[PDB]
Design a protein around this ligand. Structure first.
Ligand code: HEM
Ligand SMILES: [K+]
Length: 405
């Protein structure tokens, strides 16, 4: 339950927040995490949950910490510590300067240039799935669209058989929102067990798929090793199957309850990209951290070498000191401040692919099924972790109010 308070941790800074099951979850995950920004909560607190760790609750500290990799290392970014210690994905488990070379390689598979190339493909898949659902007048968004849309795109880019999705998806979810069936370490070894043969095979016979590119790639001009390729492909796998997938659901859940906001985008489609950013802020969902490389005093608090600190990317944009009325969605928001895709040298590499998938989904969906709502009686439930999500999303609509495009 609660780990005994280390001697150096001030008693009054204790706030037992459980990132894998926050007290106020029933009100929504973001709402649940936002409790950390209530009037009497300090900028930096310590929770005795999940082994004990600090938590920066404000955008100011979160951004500052992510910028200072000398003090806050990516070496151990996962909580609990056991997970953080087993965590060796590339390039996230690395700090500059060595981290850099691997980011460049990762960009060969997800960089903007590559994304633009995927535009037509992405649109075709979205239109395909939406048009197929359109006449049915209902669907559980998570399994009918949120999951298949981005996962298939990734699997295709990676050149991996779709039959493998169920196993892979289970493993990725155990790494972000474990149900207890396995530790982060076990899910990782299983993910690596899956990739090892595939990488060797792609290295012997170079292809044009994401795996081949990484596996036969160069970093700083030298050949990447089989282990490095594995550590990187594993991370790309995680991004492709458990980020956009979840974000889309938070977004659609909101749109299914906001006729006014839907009409805005229906009226002026050119506002979709802006709406996408506001949604990325309001429904931010990632939260990992760093480990102190040495004793360091941060904002009046004595952090000790080895201490873990959660720096919730999700909280920055929800911070009222960053955005007035943070909980309100305003597609017209003048300055949409957020760190949804991270901050610092570890800025999300899949962010361009993510925005494309989000915008295409909004554009293609609202143009065919402008009017829809949450299936009556549905008690939408959220799930919390390194990456938060929605359990199920039952949507309904009158087929007569749709349009084939
Ligand atoms: C809504 C979608 C997404 C969000 C909010 C998101 C968020 C993030 C965040 C917050 C980080 C920083 C972690 C840290 O600093 O420890 C990150 C890193 C990363 N993400 Fe994204 N992610 C998304 C989608 C994706 C996708 C689809 C992919 C791959 C296809 C991806 C690949 C990566 C990679 C490779 C990194 C590591 C960068 C490094 O360590 O230098 N992400 N992402
Ligand atoms: K580690």
């Amino acid at each position: 339950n609660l780990a005994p308070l280390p001697p150096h941790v001030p008693e009054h800074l204790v706030f037992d927040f459980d990132m894998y099951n926050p007290s106020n979850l029933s009100a929504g995950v973001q709402e649940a995490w936002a409790v950390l920004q209530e009037s009497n909560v300090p900028d930096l607190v310590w929770t005795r949950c999940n082994g004990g760790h600090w938590i920066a609750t404000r955008g100011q500290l979160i951004r500052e910490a992510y910028e200072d990799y000398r003090h806050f290392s990516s070496e151990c970014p996962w909580i609990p510590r056991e997970a953080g210690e087993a965590f060796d994905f590339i390039p996230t488990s690395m700090d500059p300067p060595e981290q850099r070379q691997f980011r460049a390689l990762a960009n060969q598979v997800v960089g903007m240039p590559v994304v633009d190339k995927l535009e037509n493909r992405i649109q075709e898949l979205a239109c395909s799935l939406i048009e197929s659902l359109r006449p049915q007048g209902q669907c559980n968004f998570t399994e009918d669209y949120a999951e298949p849309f981005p996962i298939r795109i990734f699997m295709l880019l990676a050149g991996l058989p779709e039959e493998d999705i169920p196993h892979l998806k289970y493993l990725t979810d155990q790494m972000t929102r474990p149900d207890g069936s396995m530790t982060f370490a076990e899910a990782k070894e299983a993910l690596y067990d899956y990739l090892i043969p595939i990488i060797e095979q792609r290295r012997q016979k170079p292809g044009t798929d994401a795996i081949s590119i990484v596996a036969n790639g160069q970093v700083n001009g030298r050949p990447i090793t089989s282990d490095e390729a594995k550590r990187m492909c594993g991370l790309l796998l995680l991004g492709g199957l458990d980020t956009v997938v979840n974000f889309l659901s938070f977004s659609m859940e909101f749109l299914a309850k906001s006729p006014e906001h839907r009409q805005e985008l229906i009226e002026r489609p050119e506002r979709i990209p802006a709406a996408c950013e506001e949604l990325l802020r309001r429904f931010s969902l990632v939260a990992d951290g760093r480990i102190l490389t040495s004793d360091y005093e941060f904002h009046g608090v004595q952090l000790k070498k080895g201490d873990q600190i959660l720096l919730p990317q999700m909280l920055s944009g929800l911070d009222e000191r960053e955005n007035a009325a943070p909980m309100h969605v305003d597609f017209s928001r003048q300055k949409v401040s957020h760190t949804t895709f991270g901050h610092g040298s570890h800025l999300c590499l899949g962010q361009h692919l993510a925005r494309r998938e989000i915008i295409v989904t909004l554009k293609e969906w609202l143009t065919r099924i402008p009017d829809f709502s949450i299936a009556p009686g549905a008690q939408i439930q959220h799930k919390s972790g390194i990456v938060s999500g929605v359990q199920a999303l039952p949507l309904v609509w009158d087929p007569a109010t749709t349009k084939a495009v």
